[PDB]
Each structure stands twice: as structure tokens, then as C-alpha cells.
Design a protein around this ligand. Structure first.
Ligand SMILES: */C=C\C(=O)Nc1ccc2ncnc(Nc3cccc(Br)c3)c2c1
Length: 245
């Protein structure tokens, strides 16, 4: 018993592959360029709609397909590690952070929880447009949630702070040189990544706020969004560009 998102398989006509089934670029009803990911229960993608979340377009539930808006620049992790990462500077990265926070503030208002917020699950479009996608790996996960299964918007905040380090290192894997068990144990004892090179202290302070032991003391996404948007006026107005950031 299909809902109004259903389209016919025949409605769908170049690989980008990978992932636990594939990601093709395709054409929809001969006119519309889309992404197709070749479970279900996408039921969540139908109920969320915001300009910083990747948009559902259609599903085939028969040979399954999930169809979405096309994000030309691929995932944010590949984007950052690619050619165009040596040119990114703080302003572009802080702005990308802002669009992510904003997508997440929406998710926060809708009372949902992401659970896998990390640069690999963000898609990037034209004009440095970033949208939250792909609905657990311990380096990105809050303690209370890697250990005891307590996933909340507050654990998403934690991941956000880790994503912040992904943005400021141009996509380096966090806790560099540390292994899952060493990260678990060092974080338990109160360790936190230090300020990334060239990164202003105030942005590192923001990461540490995101990484508080007590979830409830972690900031909201509305707070993170607003702080990021206003960063270069309210927080770092004497920012001078550098060799990497
Ligand atoms: C970091 C690699 C990567 O995931 N890239 C990527 C590029 C484009 C794209 N378009 C559409 N969908 C996805 N991924 C995806 C993953 C899980 C579920 C779904 Br419906 C889509 C990508 C991924």
C-alpha cells in the first residue's frame, strides 16, 4: 500500500558507487537530475523538510531505490580531502559549519536525533551549500552513547564538535594516531583534542562546549548556528587569513 512518494521503477534512468549499495546519478521522468541510492522504515526522510537537509524526491519499494536532490560536490569528507580543500579558509568553513548547525537546529526542533553526524554524512552542492544526510563509529559518538546507548540531540551536539575538527583540519580523522580503544579510554579520563593548528582558540572553546561530560550542559544547535553565523563580527572580528585557515 504505497504512499504519495511512490514512483514507478520505469520512471528512473553513471556511478558514484561505494557504501554498504551505491550512488548513481540519474534522470527522473526524462527531465530531472537526481541521486539514486540502490531498511526502508526513508520513512524519516519523508517527514523532514528543511533547506539544509538533503531532500527526498521519491522512493521505489518493490530492486529498491531512494531518490533525492542531486548534490554535485559529493560528500563533505571527500570534498575537504580533494583539490578544493587547500583553498578553503575559516570563513568558508565556519559558514559550512553554520549550514550544518542550521540543518541540525531544524532536526532539534522536530524532536529527532541523527545518530551519525560526521563529515562523511554531509553533502555539498554548488556555492558551498551543505546539507545534512544519511541518518556507530566511536570517534564521532558521545561517551554516554557509545557506552550506554543514550543517543539524544545532545549526543548529536557532541558529534558536531568532532565535525568542527574535521572542517578545521581539512578532513583529517580525529584523535590522530589514537585507536578506538585508546580514544574511548582517554576521553573517559577527560582528554579532549587540542586546538587545531591555525584555529582560533574561541572556535576551540566552542568544541569543548560541545564536548562537556554532562550532555545537558552542551549547547543547542540554535545556539551553535547563531554563534557560527555571527562569528566574524561578534567573536573574531580581527581575523586575518593564514596559510591554511
Ligand atoms: C563520502 C562518500 C559519499 O557518501 N558520497 C555520496 C555522494 C552523493 C550521494 N548522493 C545521494 N546519496 C548519498 N548517500 C546516501 C547514503 C545512505 C542513504 C542514502 Br538514501 C543516500 C550520496 C553519498
Amino acid at each position: 500500500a504505497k504512499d504519495a512518494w511512490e514512483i514507478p521503477r520505469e520512471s528512473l534512468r553513471v556511478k558514484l558507487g561505494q557504501g554498504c549499495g551505491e550512488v548513481w546519478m540519474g534522470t527522473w521522468n526524462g527531465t530531472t537530475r537526481v541521486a539514486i541510492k540502490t531498511f526502508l522504515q526513508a520513512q524519516v526522510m519523508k517527514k523532514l523538510r528543511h533547506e539544509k537537509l538533503v531532500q527526498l524526491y521519491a522512493v521505489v519499494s518493490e530492486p529498491i531505490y531512494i531518490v533525492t536532490e542531486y548534490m554535485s560536490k559529493g560528500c563533505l569528507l571527500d570534498f575537504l580531502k580533494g583539490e578544493m580543500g587547500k583553498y578553503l579558509r575559516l570563513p568558508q568553513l565556519v559558514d559550512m559549519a553554520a549550514q550544518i548547525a542550521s540543518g541540525m537546529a531544524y532536526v532539534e526542533r522536530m524532536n529527532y536525533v541523527h545518530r551519525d553526524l560526521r563529515a562523511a554524512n554531509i553533502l555539498v552542492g554548488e556555492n558551498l551549500v551543505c546539507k545534512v544526510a544519511d541518518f556507530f563509529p566511536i570517534k564521532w559518538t558521545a561517551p554516554e552513547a557509545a557506552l550506554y546507548g543514550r543517543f539524544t540531540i545532545k549526543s548529536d551536539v557532541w558529534s558536531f564538535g568532532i565535525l568542527l575538527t574535521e572542517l578545521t583540519t581539512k578532513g583529517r580523522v580525529p584523535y590522530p594516531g589514537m585507536v578506538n580503544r585508546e580514544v574511548l579510554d582517554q576521553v573517559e579520563r577527560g582528554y579532549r583534542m587540542p586546538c587545531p593548528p591555525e584555529c582560533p582558540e574561541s572556535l576551540h572553546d566552542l568544541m569543548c562546549q560541545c564536548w562537556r561530560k554532562d550532555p545537558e550542559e552542551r549547547p543547542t544547535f540554535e545556539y551553535l548556528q547563531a554563534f557560527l553565523e555571527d562569528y566574524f563580527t561578534s567573536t573574531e572580528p580581527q581575523y586575518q587569513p593564514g596559510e591554511n585557515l
